[PDB]
Each structure stands twice: as structure tokens, then as C-alpha cells.
Amino acid sequence: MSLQGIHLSDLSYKHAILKESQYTIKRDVGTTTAVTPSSLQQEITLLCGEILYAKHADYKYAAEIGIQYISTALGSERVQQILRNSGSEVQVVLTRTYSLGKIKNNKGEDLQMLDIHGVEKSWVEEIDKEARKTMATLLKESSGNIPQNQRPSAPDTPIILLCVGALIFTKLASTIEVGLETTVRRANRVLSDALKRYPRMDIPKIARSFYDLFEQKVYHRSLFIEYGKALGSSSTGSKAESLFVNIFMQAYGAGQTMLRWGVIARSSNNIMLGHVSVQAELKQVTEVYDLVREMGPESGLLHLRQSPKAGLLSLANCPNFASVVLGNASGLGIIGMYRGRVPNTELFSAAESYAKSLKESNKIN
Amino acid sequence: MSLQGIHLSDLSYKHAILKESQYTIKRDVGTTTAVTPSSLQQEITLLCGEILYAKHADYKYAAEIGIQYISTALGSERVQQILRNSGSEVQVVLTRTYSLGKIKNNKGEDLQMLDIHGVEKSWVEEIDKEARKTMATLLKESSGNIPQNQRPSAPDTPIILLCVGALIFTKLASTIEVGLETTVRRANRVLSDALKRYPRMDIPKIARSFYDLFEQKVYHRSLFIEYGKALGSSSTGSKAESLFVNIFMQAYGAGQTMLRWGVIARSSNNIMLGHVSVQAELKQVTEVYDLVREMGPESGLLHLRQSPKAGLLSLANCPNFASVVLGNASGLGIIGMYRGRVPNTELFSAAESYAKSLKESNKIN
Amino acid sequence: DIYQLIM
Amino acid sequence: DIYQLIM
RNA sequence: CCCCCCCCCCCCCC
């Protein structure tokens, strides 16, 4: 009689399969990583500040120093707990201060330098000596012209480093070249005050270091996210911290621009959504959006965390809906240089024509 | 006075017969299988990378090495529990590291190699020796030109092997020839970064090994499935793990493409669904879909698990609905080379004509 | 010199 | 006196 | 008896 019982609900079933698992995976059984006790927070800020105000030969572990500052902020045992809950069996190693040698400091004690697991001491020593030589040259050239906010010991230098890190984080679903170019361009504006304070922070090299660290140590991504979550939950903060949370929130829906652009296509009243090919797929489209609603707030972080569950949110099996959505994005000028493939060129062209006509014209409702 | 009480509900009754059984079945009572303790993950990773970067005369046990990695990722005791819950009495055996002999490694210790149950040690020795010879030749050709990502010790090489295995897993309701062709064709594209890093992994032979393993050791299918379940539930992961989960979801509705194609034919509004011969069968069609809803998310894995309960999901007793569904799929051009039988040729032809007419024309709702 | 490769 | 800077 | 096709994902701007 009626074709009413013909219904499948496959995507809900796939998410039920993935979500309801009673065995946890074990990765990185014999590996180790470094954290810093919060007591050393000052001594890491200085490090984060010495990467910034001098031109360095190598920037391999700048991202690691930012992660070390995050470790001081959250706490070493909390970072152990975060990494453990991320699904990785990495064993934390604790940062230790060691005497450099016969070198003496201004306070009369031995010069204590940080010792970070996985970061060779030669790199830290050379960064420290290079920054010290740079400050010596600046003091020799100009006397009394160095304020506090132009020094490596400024409290927000770790946050500036991590702001470059958050810029590169926003483009973790893109490629390295596009990510680096976007980071440099957006850092020239977003981090303009910091760049004016530190005119020789190598943003491209720091950003490349952050991309390398995010690719090598995926669990650190989760650590990064926790910092953002722990930062947006603070009662007060600095302007650099608010900027970091702004970039971190801009990273949210990364790797799912088709869902947002489909919402935009619906909002624009694109009549090519009424095409029969799109109607034949609106059921699975709504099912993907229902999956988003079911996953909840953590669904946006799926691609940033590089969760294997990501891909259930893909709208790639609705080629006509995707073509109409991309056409509507192109007609509004939104698409930019988005490289997502367009299956149906006719629907793309029709949607672009309607979107151009709608945007160019004006109406009163 | 009315024909309202005439009803049987036979398929639900058959499902309640098969499901509500107080007696479990015992199989594989005298048999044994191999697992590797998670603490040897590193040692198995190397092996999973040494089948990848050399050209081997024999690829018999590659699937076994992938299962060994799955065992290390899940845990030997948890894998024993999984194999017990699949309904098998196979006695797990534990992998043992043994010294090769007088041969010593770079660190000055005895070279420890894995000893897997059921795998001849000679096979492991020849795989390791061929891989070592291949890398020696490659370093003779070029000095210092081998990054980490082209080495067997890369952490994702077991995942690459298991992705070839998952490609062969997607085609487990097909035949061996079609499955092998599909795996090679899809692996040339999907596993392209791996094939660039490892230019001499014999995908056909590894795929045949995985097909064999899934034939003799059916319980390992369950193990495979658990890995996917355990892998899509992780907060983070590698790119290769996301690829594995993507193929594993692509394997979901395997063996039940007529249900999906009937949902399509309903979404395609094929008018020949309204033919009286099909109308006489929509009630049992609806019962089949009701059975899918009753089984729930585990209904998609019925054919992958090779459950005897599979076949209750068959629409083969509704020949006219099957003919109309196949005709609608053929008209839309999605039937491909599907070899399902078409009982009613006239309904097939009419449905295909209507679906072609619908696809060619464009309408706006 | 085959068994001391770094891998 | 490079190491006696205030930083 | 059943089954049988095809297909990673991502990618803009702020």
C-alpha cells in the first residue's frame, strides 16, 4: 500500500557503532614527552620571550616551549591526565633546572637553565645566548629605551607565541602551504601590537614549528584545546589571552565548511534547493545535521582533534546538494578559493546564477 | 465481514525464534590463535613496516601481522575476551621475543625478534632479512636521503597494512576476484601517500593474504570490527587511523545493497512502485525494514560478521519489488555491474525507463 | 653490515 | 658581561 | 539458500 516503512537510518547506526565501544585503543606505549612543573612558569616565560625578540638560527622547539608554558599553566599532573584521556599512553617526563656551569647571574647565584625532555640543551643554550647578545646590542645602541613590554620577561610572550600557534591551529584541516600563508597574513594584522613590541619574531618559522609539532604529536592538539577551554573559562585575563581565545574559537568548525555553507544556502532561500536531485538527498542531509546535533559541542572539534570518528559528518555522499551549496557560496562571493570538488556543474551554475541575482538585487519583506 | 484480522508477522516470529535461544554454540574448541602483548607494539610496528618497503616472495602472514598489531592496540586479554564473545573457543597464545642468535644490533644487545604462534619463524627471518637488504641497497644508492616517513619503524605502517586489510574487508560479501580488483584499484588512489613513501608494497599479495585470513579465521572479522569500534571512539588519532575508520564505515551495509537501493527507489519516487504486483509486497518489504530497525545498529555488520542470522534481511521473496528496485537503480545509472538477479523483466524495463526519464529531466519543487 | 641498520 | 643582563 | 555495483576525508575568509 504505502511506502512508509522503507527507511534505513544508516548514519545513526554507524555513529552508534563507533560511540558504543567497550574497548579503548592503546597507542604510543613506549614513548615519552616533556612537561614543566608550574613552579618553573617564570623560567618558561623568559624562554618564550627569548624566541621572540631575537633572530634565531633554528626554531625547531618553539612550539614545544609554547606547549611547556601550557603545561605550567594547567599543571604537570593535569597534563598527564589530559594526555591519558586523549587515548595515548605517552609517559610524561618533567622539566628540570640545571646549573649552566661557572656562569654567574646578576643575583649572585648560578645561572639556572631549563632542561626539557626531547629538546636538546644546545638549542635552549643557543636561543638564550642569542637573545642575550641581542639585548646587549640594543642596550649599547639605545640606553634607557627598553620598556617592560619590549623585554623577553614580559608575562604575555608565551601568549604571543601561542597566538601564532592558534593561527596555525585554525588551518589544521588545510595544507601546510595555505596554513603558513594564512598564518603570516593574519599575524601581520592580528598580532600587530606584539609585532611592534618584538620587531624580529620570525612568524613563518614559529608557525612552521607549530605545524610540525601538531603533526608529530597529535595528543598535543588535545592539550592545546584544553588550554583554550581552560582560558575561555577564566574570570579575568589579559588582552593577549582574549585574542588567543578569539582565534581558538575561530578554529572551531574547522574541516566542516560544507555544513556551514549548507546552512547559508538554506538561509539564502536558494531555489535550486527545490531541484528534484536535491530533494532526493535532503533526507541524508538532514540525517548528517541530526548527527551533528547528537554529537553536540564536541562535534566542531572533531577534525581539529583529528578524531577518527570525523568523516561521519561528511556531506560527500550528497553530490547534488553539495553542488547547489557550492554554487550558492560562489554566487555570494563566499567560496573564495575553496577546493572542494563540484560533482554537478549544471546545479552549480544554476545556484551561482540565482545567488548572484539575489545578492545583486534588493527586496523588502 | 472484513479482512482485517488476516495477518501473520512471520519474519518477526523467525527473528524471535533465532534471537531468543537459551543455548550457545561452541566451536573451535581444540584450536589456538596468536596474540601479541601490547608492550611489544613497537616490535610489531617494525614488522608491519618491513612487509611494506621490500619486495617479498611470500606475503602469506601479512594479515596475521596486522591482527597482531590489532592485538597490541587492544590488549591480549581483551582480545581473548573479544574472541570468546564472538562465539569461538580459540585458545589465545602469546607472542614471545626471542634472540636471533650470535647476531647483535647497533646498541650492543642481542637482536630480539618476534615469535608469533602459527607463523613460521623462517618467514619472519626472511621478511626481516629482505627488508634489511633492501634498505642497505637504498642507502648505498643515496646517503642520508631516507626520512622517518620512508622507514619501516614509522608508527602508521601497521595502520597502512590494516587499511589494505580494510579495503579487502569492504568487499567481503563479493567474490575474491572482484574484491581483489576493487582493493587494488581503490588502494592506488586512497593509499597514495603510503605508496609514495613505500614504492614497493605488493598490495595484491597483501590483499590476498587478508582475504585468506578473513576466510579461515572468521572470529578475526569480529576482532577487526572491534578495532574499528575501538578506533572511532578515540579522541585523537593519526591520518591513517582516520582513513581506516573511513573505509571501515564504507564497509557497513555490505551484503544488503538491495535495502539501500530500495530506500533510493522510494526517494526516487519511481511510479512503478505503485504497480499492483509490487503493492502486494510492500507489506513484507516493510516487515524487512522493521526487522532492520529491530536489530538496530548491529544489523549492518551481519554479513561482515558472517552471522547465520543474516538472510532474514533478504528481500528475495519479493521478486517484483526487487525488479523495480533494480530497474530504478539501473535507470539512475548506479546499478553498475551488480549481479543481482531480476525476476520480473517487464517491471525492470518499465522502472528503468521511468528512472531514466526522471534523471534526464530537471524540475523545481 | 646488514643487521645494524637504524630502521 | 652577556649573562648579567636583566632580561 | 543468501550474496554480488561504486566511493577515504579535508581544502575559503575573518
Numbering used by the authors:
A (entry chain A), B (entry chain C): 1 to 365
C (entry chain D), D (entry chain B): 10 to 16
Question: What wording appears in the published article?
Answer:
The viral genome is encapsidated in a sheath of oligomerized copies of the nucleoprotein N, forming a ribonucleoprotein complex termed nucleocapsid. The nucleocapsid is the template for transcription and replication by L, which is also dependent on the obligate polymerase cofactor, the phosphoprotein P, together forming the active L/P holoenzyme. In oligomerized and RNA-bound N (N-RNA) the nucleic acid is threaded along an extended groove in between the NTDs and CTDs of laterally connected N protomers. An important function of the C-terminal domain of P in nsNSVs is to bind to assembled N-RNA, forming an N-RNA/P complex.
We incubated N-RNA preparations with a ~ 100-fold molar excess of synthetic peptide covering the 9 last residues of PCT (N-EDDIYQLIM-C). In the reconstructions, additional density was visible at the periphery of the NTD of N. To facilitate easier model building and to obtain improved maps, we carried out symmetry expansion and local refinement of a dimer of N-RNA/P as before with N-RNA. The final resolution was at 2.9 Å and comparison of the N-RNA and N-RNA/P dimer maps revealed a density of sufficient quality to allow refinement of a model of the bound PCT. The locally refined cryo-EM map resolved the residues 288 to 294 of the PCT bound to N-RNA. PCT is wedged in between a helix of N (N residues 121-141, helix αI2, RSV numbering) on one side and an extended loop of a beta-hairpin of N (NβHL, N residues 99-112) on the other, burying a total area of ~1100 Å2 upon complex formation. We observed a noticeable increase in ordered density of NβHL upon P-binding, compared to the apo form (black arrow). We observe that the P peptide wraps around a central arginine at position R132 belonging to helix αI2.P hooks onto this arginine by packing the hydrophobic surfaces of PCT side-chains P-M294, P-L292, P-I289, and P-Y290 against the aliphatic chain of R132, thereby completely surrounding it. R132 is additionally stabilized and kept in position through a polar contact with D128. The C-terminal methionine of P (P-M294) inserts into a hydrophobic cavity on N formed by L46 and M135. Moreover, the face of the aromatic ring of P-Y290 packs against three hydrophobic residues located within NβHL: L100, I103, and L111.
